[PDB]
Nucleic acid binder design. Sequence first.
DNA 1: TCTTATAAATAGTT
DNA 2: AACTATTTATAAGA
Lengths: 17, 91, 93
Amino acid sequence: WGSGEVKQKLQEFVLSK
Amino acid sequence: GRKKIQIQRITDERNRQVTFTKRKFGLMKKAYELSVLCDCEIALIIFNHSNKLFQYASTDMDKVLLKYTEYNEPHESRTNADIIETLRKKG
Amino acid sequence: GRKKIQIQRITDERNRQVTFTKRKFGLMKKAYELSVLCDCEIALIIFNHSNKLFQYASTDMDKVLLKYTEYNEPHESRTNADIIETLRKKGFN
DNA sequence: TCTTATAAATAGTT
DNA sequence: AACTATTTATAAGA
């Protein structure tokens, strides 16, 4: 939920579908 | 409970909030129990009527979310509509 | 149930599988009920003991996950340790 | 897979 | 903030 790598990876995963 | 209720939106604001707190805990308690009995890892994400966030993970939300991104195989995915259909079938 | 159980790991493989299927449905049903009664949006992610994936969302999983990534305030966050703490403090009710 | 006896969660009142 | 009668969930049976 905050600025970091986990947030970035989840966002990328959802958007790439 | 003292009476059976219909599963429909509660419009009384106090009752909605009381119900939310109680049932949110109940749901997390059932998640804890499933995680221990069946050796699984669980996460819950909840946005309430005000769009405030509440979360639970049996151990670590970071790990659950990262693993979620790696899973490629077909898997079970259900929604409210599916649950309602199962309840019709159950009668 | 026909007999009282305690909350501990099930070692019998068959019983574990049966219990998992039944309690997984029960958990998703409670999520459905909370979502409708209280106007919540809910996602549930479950990895079983072999790390097979099962999911539920009240309406749309992708919407809930993206809202999670957009949230930029402190909020209530619980783990099994918190649940146990609440149980230790609560009454027999 | 469904049913049944019994335990757990909760609706209404306080 | 607690209480309890009842509805709902489920552990073991069919």
